[PDB]
A paper describes a structure:
After purifying the protein to homogeneity, two methyl groups were covalently linked to the free amine nitrogen of lysine residues by treating the protein with formaldehyde and dimethylamine borane complex (DMAB). Electron density for only 9 amine nitrogens out of 32 (including the N-terminal amine group), could be unambiguously assigned as dimethylated. Forty new intra molecular (NZ)CH...O contacts in the range 3.2 to 4.0 Å were generated because of the methylation, of which 25 interactions were between 3.2 to 3.8 Å. The methyl carbons of all the dimethylated lysine residues were involved in the formation of multiple new symmetry-generated intermolecular contacts. The structure reveals 96 new symmetry-generated inter molecular contacts in the range 3.2 – 5.0 Å involving the (NZ)CH group and 28 of these inter molecular contacts are of the (NZ)CH...O type and in the range 3.2 – 4.0 Å. Analytical ultracentrifugation analysis and thermodynamics results revealed a more compact protein structure with better solvent exclusion of buried Trp residues in the folded state of the methylated protein, assisting crystallization. Interestingly, we found that the chemical modification resulted in a decrease in the mid-point of unfolding in both GdmCl and thermal denaturation, which corresponds to a decrease in the free energy of unfolding, Δ GU,H20, of 18 ± 3 kJ/mol. The only short contacts – a 3.0 Å link between the CH2 methyl carbon of MLY221 and a phosphate oxygen, and a 3.1 Å bond between the carboxyl oxygens of E36 and the MLY221 methyl carbons, resulted in the distortion of the conformation of the MLY221 and the glutamic acid, suggesting steric clashes due to the excessive closeness of the methyl carbon and the oxygen atoms. The methylated protein lost its ability to cleave DNA (results not shown). The dimethylation of K221 sitting at the edge of the active site may sterically hinder access of the active site to the incoming DNA.
Numbering used by the authors: 11 to 242
C-alpha cells in the first residue's frame, strides 16, 4: 500500500482510551527510543467514541502509555472513521524461542489448562478457546478473555526474565514459516476481534490482552518529526 503524508492534530493524552494491555518490553523500548532520539515520529491513530469527546486508541498504546509515564500532555494523532471499510483489523501472533515445557508449567501454575488437541488451532480461530499453542505438538488453552490475559502475563514475565524470547508476528503464515526454519519453537493463535467488538469493549471500559489488534489502513501514514519537548 502507498505511503501518504496525512495531516495530524495534537490530542491530549487524557482523552485517549486503550483497548488492549501493554507488553513491558515494548513500553520500555518506546520510552528509551523517544528520550534518546528526542523525536516522536509515528502518529497515534485514533477514532472518536460516539456520544463522547474521547477517542479509541486504534494504534499507539505503548506510545500513549510511555508518554503518560514521562509526564507528557499531548501527542500528534491521525483521526480515523473507525467503521470506514478501509480500516481493517487483524491480530498478532505471539511466538517464542524457548522450552515449551517450561512455558506450559508456568501456564498451569497460573490456573490454566493446557490440553493436547489436534483441533486446537481451528477452535482458537472460531473463538472457542483462549489460545491454541502450536508447534511440534498442538495444545488448546481453554477459556476466553481472562485466560488470554493470564497467558499474556506469563509470556511477559518469561520475556522479562529472558527464559524465552517473545516475538509478535503480524501473519500466522510467517510464524509457521519461521518455525519450519527453526527460528521459533511455538506460536500462540487466537481469533482476531472485529471492529465492532473493539468499539464495544472500549465503550464498557475494558481492555483485551496485549497485542490483540493489528489494524491496517489503505495507506501508510508517513512519519512525522515532532520534538518530544513539544508534547509537554
Ligand atoms: Na493493537
Amino acid at each position: 500500500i502507498p505511503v501518504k503524508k496525512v495531516e495530524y492534530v495534537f490530542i491530549e493524552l487524557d482523552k485517549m482510551k486503550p483497548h488492549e494491555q501493554l507488553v513491558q518490553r515494548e513500553l520500555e523500548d518506546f520510552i528509551e527510543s523517544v528520550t534518546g532520539s528526542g523525536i516522536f515520529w509515528k502518529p497515534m491513530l485514533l477514532a472518536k467514541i460516539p456520544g463522547t469527546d474521547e477517542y479509541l486508541i486504534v494504534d499507539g498504546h505503548h506510545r500513549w502509555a510511555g508518554l503518560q509515564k514521562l509526564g507528557a500532555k499531548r501527542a500528534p494523532s491521525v483521526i480515523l472513521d473507525y467503521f470506514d471499510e478501509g480500516v481493517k483489523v487483524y491480530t498478532w501472533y505471539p511466538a517464542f524461542k524457548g522450552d515449551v515445557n517450561k512455558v506450559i508449567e508456568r501456564l498451569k501454575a497460573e490456573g490454566l489448562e493446557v490440553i493436547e488437541d489436534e483441533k486446537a488451532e481451528e477452535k482458537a480461530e472460531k473463538g472457542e478457546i483462549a489460545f491454541a499453542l502450536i508447534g511440534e505438538k498442538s495444545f488448546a488453552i481453554p477459556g476466553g478473555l481472562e485466560e488470554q490475559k493470564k497467558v499474556s502475563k506469563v509470556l511477559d514475565e518469561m520475556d522479562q526474565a529472558k527464559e524465552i524470547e517473545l516475538v509478535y508476528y503480524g501473519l500466522k503464515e510467517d510464524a509457521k514459516a519461521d518455525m519450519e526454519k527453526g527460528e521459533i519453537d511455538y506460536v500462540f493463535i487466537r481469533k482476531a476481534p472485529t471492529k465492532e467488538e473493539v468499539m464495544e469493549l472500549v465503550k464498557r471500559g475494558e481492555v483485551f490482552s496485549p497485542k490483540t489488534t493489528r489494524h491496517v489502513l489503505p495507506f501508510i501514514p508517513d512519519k512525522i518529526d515532532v520534538k518530544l519537548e513539544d508534547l509537554f
